[PDB]
Amino acid sequence: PPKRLTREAMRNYLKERGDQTVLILHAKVAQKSYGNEKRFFCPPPCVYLMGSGWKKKKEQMERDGCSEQESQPCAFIGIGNSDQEMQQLNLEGKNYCTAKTLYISDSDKRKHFMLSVKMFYGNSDDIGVFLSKRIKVISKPSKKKLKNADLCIASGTKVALFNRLRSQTVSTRYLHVEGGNFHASSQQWGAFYIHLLDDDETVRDGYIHYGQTVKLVCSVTGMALPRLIIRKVDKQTALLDADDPVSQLHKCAFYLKDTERMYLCLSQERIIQFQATPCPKEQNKEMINDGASWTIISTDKAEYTFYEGMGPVLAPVTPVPVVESLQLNGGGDVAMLELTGQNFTPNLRVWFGDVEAETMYRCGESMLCVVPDISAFREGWRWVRQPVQVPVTLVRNDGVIYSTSLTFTYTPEP
DNA sequence: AATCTTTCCCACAGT
DNA sequence: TTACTGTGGGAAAGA
């Protein structure tokens, strides 16, 4: 039968933390296909397997007699209904795989959907079903123009940047940090924070408009580009006088501030600067290189982390709970902690460090638990003598551990 | 009338 | 050459 997590096994986990993590990276918007069209999601949704637990799991399975294909994690992806209209992803040799041929027909009437990722090992042992964040279905890019918060880009949020032509032999390329440099990758795409700057030269809020100075920061490596002025393009000109909101899937260019019309530009797989030509017709326009035209789109991320605290289990690890936030109560006579998040179940207990707490399930989004007494952690303490911080972890009845990034602090009373 | 969003159509450059 | 395929741009339709 399945075993409950022991205090010792929790201690061992807390010491090492070899979690298995599934990340799903995708755009927040998808353009619908009309008729027999296939307009593929771009950038292509990406599944990443993160953490040292994938290697540990793989070694455990092979020691127990699995071959390499049997221990290989497998993934299928689709857009959230029936059927095995799900497309296979190849994760062999890679950390990750992109879903390059997903689309949504106009016969689908949903205004929003989630990607569904189904995972199992090559021996057919179920891992489970992992959901993306919400994706809004759009008809096509505008323009021009804010009341539609969903179609605008807020300062501090993440964007992908890709470079297309209508038809080319060469692969669509995506801004992606790799090998210690910004590159225009055919295989992976980065998500960049887009920071609006005080254009004097720090954080400034609100939505991004053409003609504003922004900083692009890789959400993964923290690498940053120089100050850029984001400008609007149509066909092959950057419009110098546009100042309307930047919107989903619009073409734009990045003029390197204080430069003699140099723009961020791709060259094969390299990111360079290229000089625009001044345009004799009208002076409020500059002709740009095709490598200097980028499509911008807001990006999101679903992340699930799990660990077999008591060894292999027969139930899938999913639905994986995610804790958004922690709220202290008091309240009743008991010190209570409220957890808000997703995928909660009555088979979960909140653990404070290596101490299991009485936990009350309310719904998939809410749980309460009894804050252990400080002596719990500090033997003989009859009150909080100095601050004590402990990790908060969710644990399932079969010993699977769902780590949280959150802690709880006991603070001395003033 | 006017303006905006959705759907439909076509042509490009690659198979 | 003709036939077929995603994609951007622009026309037509619907709101």
Swiss-Prot record:
Effect of mutating residue 347 to R: No effect on interaction with L3MBTL3
Entry's Gene Ontology molecular function annotations: chromatin binding; DNA binding; DNA-binding transcription activator activity, RNA polymerase II-specific; RNA polymerase II cis-regulatory region sequence-specific DNA binding; RNA polymerase II-specific DNA-binding transcription factor binding; sequence-specific DNA binding
Keywords assigned: Acetylation, Activator, Cytoplasm, DNA-binding, Notch signaling pathway, Nucleus, Repeat, Repressor, Transcription, Transcription regulation
Effect of residue 365 to R: No effect on interaction with L3MBTL3
UniProt-reported outcome of changing residue 338 to R: No effect on interaction with L3MBTL3
Residue span, IPT/TIG domain: 321-411
UniProt keyword Cytoplasm, yes or no: yes
Entry GO CC: cytoplasm; MAML1-RBP-Jkappa- ICN1 complex; nucleolus; nucleoplasm; nucleus; transcription regulator complex; transcription repressor complex
Effect ascribed to mutating residue 120 to R: No effect on interaction with L3MBTL3
Outcome (variant: residue 273 to R): No effect on interaction with L3MBTL3
Effect of residue 362 to E: No effect on interaction with L3MBTL3
Effect on the protein upon substituting residue 224 to R: Decreased interaction with L3MBTL3
Modified residues (N6-acetyllysine): 147
Location(s) in or outside the cell: Nucleus; Cytoplasm
Gene Ontology biological process terms, A to Z: angiogenesis; aortic valve development; arterial endothelial cell fate commitment; artery morphogenesis; atrioventricular canal development; auditory receptor cell fate commitment; B cell differentiation; blood vessel endothelial cell fate specification
Chain segments carrying region DNA-binding: 31-41, 139-144, 164-169
Coiled-coil portions: none
General function of this protein: Transcriptional regulator that plays a central role in Notch signaling, a signaling pathway involved in cell-cell communication that regulates a broad spectrum of cell-fate determinations. Acts as a transcriptional repressor when it is not associated with Notch proteins. When associated with some NICD product of Notch proteins (Notch intracellular domain), it acts as a transcriptional activator that activates transcription of Notch target genes.
Sequence similarity: Belongs to the Su(H) family.
Subunit-level organization: Interacts with RITA1, leading to nuclear export, prevent the interaction between RBPJ and NICD product and subsequent down-regulation of the Notch signaling pathway. Interacts with activated NOTCH1, NOTCH2 and NOTCH3. Interacts with MINT/SHARP. This interaction may mediate the recruitment of large corepressor complexes containing proteins such as HDAC1, HDAC2, NCOR2, SAP30, FHL1/KYOT2 and CIR1. Interacts with EP300, MAML1 and PTF1A. Interacts with SNW1. Interacts with CHCHD2 and CXXC5. Interacts with BEND6 (via BEN domain). Interacts with NKAPL. Interacts with ZMIZ1. Interacts with RBM15.
Entry protein name: Recombining binding protein suppressor of hairless
Recorded name of the encoding gene: Rbpj
Parent-protein start and end of this portion: 53 to 474 of 526
